């Protein structure tokens, strides 16, 4: 597996152990499930890029105790 | 008055970073400063060159599209692999603006500042005080004496998980630009009174990105006679004077201070 922290915009931190091939799509549902937020309405950004549901930790090349960045979605 | 980009393929959220980059007083006499081969160098040269036509029928008008869209089209390739973006898609400029930053350092250190998220839960004891360094920093669920002097905002414990205690920026060392972003926007849209005074060098909202409709992103500069410009990439070309300041509070998403 691999650690990792999710930080969002109000200082709030999450840790999560998922496997290094695992797509990011059930950590990310997790994420929102423990903080009350909707997949619809959030985003992950890791070391400043984008990250897709499809994406995996291995794709991505993320290391253990990496951290991913949350954003309310506020696109346009 | 001032020409502006015209809206395609969805790039308000690359628009409304460049409009705000060509009104900075700042980083012009930076640009100006270096010496050639610059990304930032074409960016304010092709905006001239498209504002000294504006100044003086529709010939003129392409030229002015090919000279902002060459350089639009270059930054946004620029920007592309890292953003992971394909042309036509909706993007953020809480996003795509450090990365921005990141293509010429020297143009980035402008916008760096220094600061320390403070924070002492009252619940029980959870404490810290960790510094930073950023260009871009993002404010949620702010107090509404919300001040970059007293920069605070709500957010829970991360020791007991309790809600409302307060984190507040503490700024250590201001950047001739610095910027903000907003979740919500701020308290009120009087912007004279989002100004502050640091370590001797008055710091005034020069320069505002709105977020309309939670769809579309639009430029708001602050010109010299008081009066303001609405740069709206879908209202084409040109632009708009405003008597005075018009985004919602709400819809206030970037703040940009400046004067050093
Ligand atoms: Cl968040
Ligand atoms: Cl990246
Ligand atoms: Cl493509
Ligand atoms: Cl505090
Ligand atoms: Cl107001
Ligand atoms: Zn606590």
């Known amino acids: ?76 | 008055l001032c020409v502006q980009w015209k809206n395609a393929y969805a790039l308000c959220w690359l628009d409304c970073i460049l409009s705000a980059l060509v009104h900075s007083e700042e980083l012009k006499n930076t640009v100006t400063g270096l010496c050639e081969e610059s990304i930032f160098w074409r960016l304010l040269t092709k905006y001239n060159q498209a504002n000294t036509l504006l100044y003086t029928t529709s010939e003129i008008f392409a030229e002015i599209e090919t000279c902002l869209n060459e350089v639009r089209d270059e930054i946004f390739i620029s920007l592309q692999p890292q953003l992971r973006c394909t042309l036509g898609d909706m993007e953020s400029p809480v996003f795509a603006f450090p990365l921005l930053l990141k293509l010429e350092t020297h143009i980035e250190k402008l916008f760096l500042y220094s600061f320390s998220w403070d924070f002492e839960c009252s619940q029980c004891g959870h404490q810290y005080q960790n510094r930073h360094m950023k260009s871009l920093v993002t404010f949620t669920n702010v107090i509404p004496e919300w001040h970059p002097l007293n920069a605070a905002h709500f957010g829970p414990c991360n020791n007991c998980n309790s809600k409302s205690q307060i984190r507040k920026m503490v700024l250590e060392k201001v950047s001739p630009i610095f910027m903000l972003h907003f979740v919500e926007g701020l308290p009120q849209n009087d912007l004279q009174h989002y100004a502050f005074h640091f370590e001797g060098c008055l710091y005034q909202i020069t320069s505002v990105i709105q977020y309309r409709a939670n769809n579309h992103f639009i430029t708001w500069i602050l010109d010299a006679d008081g009066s303001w410009l609405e740069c709206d990439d879908l209202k084409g070309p040109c632009s708009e004077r405003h008597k005075k300041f018009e985004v919602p509070a709400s819809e206030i998403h970037i703040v940009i201070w400046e004067r050093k």
């Open chain 1, 1 to 76: 597996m691999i650690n990792l922290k999710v930080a969002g915009q109000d200082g709030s931190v999450v840790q999560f152990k998922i496997k290094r091939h695992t797509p990011l799509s059930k950590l990310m549902k997790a994420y929102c499930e423990r903080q009350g937020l909707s997949m619809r309405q959030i985003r992950f950004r890791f070391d400043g890029q984008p990250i897709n549901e499809t994406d995996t930790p291995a794709q991505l090349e993320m290391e253990d105790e990496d951290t991913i960045d949350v954003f309310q979605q506020q696109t346009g």
